[PDB]
Design a binder for this molecule. Structure first.
Ligand SMILES: CC(C)[C@H]1Cc2cc(F)ccc2S(=O)(=O)N(C[C@@H](O)[C@H](Cc2ccccc2)NC(=O)O[C@H]2CCOC2)C1
Ligand SMILES: [Cl-]
Ligand SMILES: [Cl-]
Ligand SMILES: [Cl-]
Lengths: 99, 99
């Protein structure tokens, strides 16, 4: 699809068999989702944003579908204000910016 | 142009007679720039991001040039860790997400 930016670029994602709303975010290096249960071991990570940082849990090789496009990669879990799909997964789905 | 997302989508902007590097950020509703002088009236605003909120000065009707594309809109000025071009200006240059 071609998504304009007059409203937030919110899409439906599927992770752990559950549908969630998330923001396609070119300004985010990484994908960070609100608290949920994911399988396997996690590693520590810090993410810096506008008003400071949040500590997150890094899960690797997680199956996630974004607007019907299947991806497998790193998902961070933590106290983010919104679910964010960052560049690590936007590249997997072949997303570009165009003007 | 077509901008891939293998690295941060940084571009040169011209604002307030200065050249700055800024991130094309679909996840940002607003444009926020590091401390600089801008002409005209301003009012205070709080903006939230992953790590809480920052206080900024809101300047309206500011002309920016992004990749040879001129636009006008509100620009927020404050202690952002990165200069961000948000949706309010991305729409004006005809920027879309494509996959
Ligand atoms: C509604 C929310 C989404 C947005 C809230 C928001 C709203 C605005 F009107 C302007 C800025 C921002 S924000 O900068 O706080 N941000 C945009 C994100 O794209 C930031 C931009 C940024 C980059 C680097 C340093 C500071 C800010 N990325 C961000 O927080 O990336 C983290 C998240 C995962 O990867 C790293 C989140
Ligand atoms: Cl990844
Ligand atoms: Cl505006
Ligand atoms: Cl349009």
């Amino acid at each position: 699809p071609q998504i304009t930016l007059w409203k937030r670029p919110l899409v439906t994602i599927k992770i752990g068999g559950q549908l969630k709303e998330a923001l396609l975010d070119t300004g985010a290096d990484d994908t960070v989702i609100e608290e949920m249960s994911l399988p396997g071991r996690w590693k520590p990570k810090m993410i810096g944003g506008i008003g400071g940082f949040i500590k997150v849990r890094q899960y690797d090789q997680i199956i996630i579908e974004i607007c019907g496009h299947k991806a497998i990669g790193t998902v961070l879990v933590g106290p983010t204000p919104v679910n964010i799909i960052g560049r690590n997964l936007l590249t997997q789905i072949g997303c570009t910016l165009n003007f």
